[PDB]
């Protein structure tokens, strides 16, 4: 099954992604094919898939930017029916906004079927131009048709996945936990993570003993990421991944504070030095407290 | 012995405090008697006492605002010698900036003696007017003279004192620790703590599931306090007290995040709700992680 998560949805045949035109949160806003830059935040192309309680393999798809939902217009089974962004709710009973998502065929990409119409999300004619029409179209679960095949590029981790990554890291010991009970976390490309840091006021903040110390840079970074996420995205029910770790030597004579992020494959924790913007794998010693 | 700490130094005879004129960090800035508002931050009247390694009962006194030190002018033993703020260092060997601080007589207030001149810090003539001269003056360790008697109103806690207060609180369990190894923390009057919150952007920040959740308000408050301290004070080697606690129900079905502060007697932890600015004693349940 597709996991609950944030996905960048990329067409199997041509390198277009599912784009919400200009990220508008207006009802009736077209969802179109559009190019993307990998390992960046693609602002109008991020989709939060929420699983529907007791409908198997079926999700709402909320655009992160707009906070509006992928909507098959008036639920029509007609080939060429518009797919738009439309106001909604995560666990709606509106089938215009319910999508059964299952693997093709190739066993790797998915098909996206409207729960009501039973038609599939189609990049019409496999058109790779920017703003190319996306519509509901007749199709089958097992056919090879690339217009209806989409890679679900997982952009997020669950609390469980986050814990497991921290659990396999040699530098995080003692207590480590996420605040959110079963959260979904957008893992930022380092490019984006660095952007936030650059605009945070930390680069030009001076380290000062006790009064503006390592713990403060780490905290300040995490707040900057908190604020950025809230200000940048209209969707709710997800968080931005940014850990804080607080550590001490074997000798209680040196302390360290770091932020941490995740590799793009979501397997490994990487540390971030909020004073100068460095990424680090080996910081040894460890922490007594890590949260995200 | 006087403990290392931040003190508001109030004359025993009249209600004047040791004031650094206009908080200027200019060498030669007069230190004068001046009125104060209790349970507020008195901006020019806060003094960080640092103990001198291997000189008993002897401290530097650094004004928090200016980052300059109480200085007896050219070290003169002459009655009426000026006491000024002057650039320096915490563990300086300059006796103009070294002060032996010991209890009077009344067993409660202290006398402040220049280590070099052996004369005492004197509110000249017990003059309670604002801007009244403070000078070095002949005196004795045991005399009753109120001009040379000063209450050291402790404004701060050590890491040890902070731990002990958290240790006696029924709502803080699991891991709790301060980042700084033997830190000195200014405990804010709630009035000041509330001011920071009011100007932090939190009052008008909207709670949003996961993306701007309780952990984020708590973190954001702590960063606001971090920034306020750095921006407000020129002295180093001290921190502002503001804890963060992260908690969960017995049932893993409800989470809470709070900040915490200390009572003015430094004995008890009080929780702060960063969403709406509330102060709370009983939050039960507890935390799994608390830091400051
Ligand atoms: C209100 C308004 O008109 N704002 C404009 C933005 O919508 C527009 O942002 C672009 O929106 C499109 C389509 O909705 C794309 O999402 C685009 O990003 C994508 O294409 C880029 C090249 O066009 C690039 O490849 C990105 O990597 C990819 O995500 C997005 O920038 C901008 C710029 O066109 O103008 C705004 O004023
Ligand atoms: C035969 C016919 O045309 N039927 C109409 C329905 O399709 C229509 O339902 C609306 O369809 C739109 C576009 O597909 C949305 O799906 C809409 O649902 C969402 O928007 C509503 C506000 O516009 C509201 O916010 C809902 O909570 C949200 O789910 C859906 O109502 C209805 C209603 O217009 O009319 C039928 O005649
Ligand atoms: C650069 C400049 O001139 N700034 C002025 C401030 O210095 C001044 O701040 C006052 O400074 C005095 C003496 O240095 C006191 O510290 C004063 O605070 C104290 O007195 C207040 C009444 O005068 C009140 O009682 C406070 O509780 C007590 O701490 C402090 O405000 C201000 C205001 O005079 O003007 C600035 O422009
Ligand atoms: C007989 C006589 O007058 N002796 C002079 C000394 O008093 C004087 O020492 C200076 O005194 C000032 C005012 O008391 C300061 O105490 C000063 O120390 C601090 O300031 C220095 C810069 O001004 C420097 O920053 C030091 O590191 C710091 O401790 C102290 O030097 C000396 C030097 O002027 O001259 C003697 O003739």
Report on the structure:
- The structure is a homodimer of 292-residue chains.
- The first copy, chain A, is mainly beta and 292 residues long.
- Chain A folds into two domains: 154 residues, Trefoil (Acidic Fibroblast Growth Factor, subunit A) (Trefoil), CATH 2.80.10; 138 residues, Beta Polymerase, domain 2, CATH 3.30.460.
- Helix content of chain A is 13%, strand content 34%.
- Chain A contains three helices and 21 strands.
- In chain A, the strands form four sheets. In chain A, strands 9-8-5-4-1-12 form a six-stranded antiparallel beta sheet, with no helix packed on it.
- In chain A, a hairpin with an 8-residue loop joins strand 6 and strand 7.
- The radius of gyration of chain A is 21 Å and the shape is elongated.
- The interface between A and B is large, with 42 and 42 residues.
- The complex binds a molecule of 3 linked components (NAG-GAL-GAL) (4 copies).
- Chains A, B: Keywords: Calcium, Metal-binding, Zinc.
- Chains A, B: One of its GO terms (molecular function) is metal ion binding.
- Chains A, B: It comes from Marasmius oreades.
- Chains A, B: This is Agglutinin.
Query: Could you name the CATH class of the largest domain in chain A?
Result: Mainly Beta
The order of strands across the largest sheet of chain A is 9-8-5-4-1-12
- Reading the helices and strands of chain A in chain order gives EEEEEEEEEEEEEHEEHHEEEEEE
Bound molecules: a molecule of 3 linked components (NAG-GAL-GAL)
CATH architecture of the largest domain in chain A: Trefoil
CATH T-level fold name of the largest domain in chain A: Trefoil (Acidic Fibroblast Growth Factor, subunit A)
**Count of discrete structural domains of chain A:** 2
| Amino-to-carboxy terminus distance of chain A | 27 Å
| Oligomeric state as shown | homodimer
Our estimate of the beta-strand percent of chain A is 25-35%
Supply Rg of chain A.
Answer: 21 Å
Number of helices of chain A: 3
Largest sheet of chain A: 6 strands, antiparallel
Helix content of chain A: 10-25%
PDB class: sugar binding protein
Keywords: beta-trefoil, sugar binding protein
Assembly: dimeric
Entry title: Crystal structure of MOA, a lectin from the mushroom Marasmius oreades in complex with the trisaccharide Gal(1,3)Gal(1,4)GlcNAc
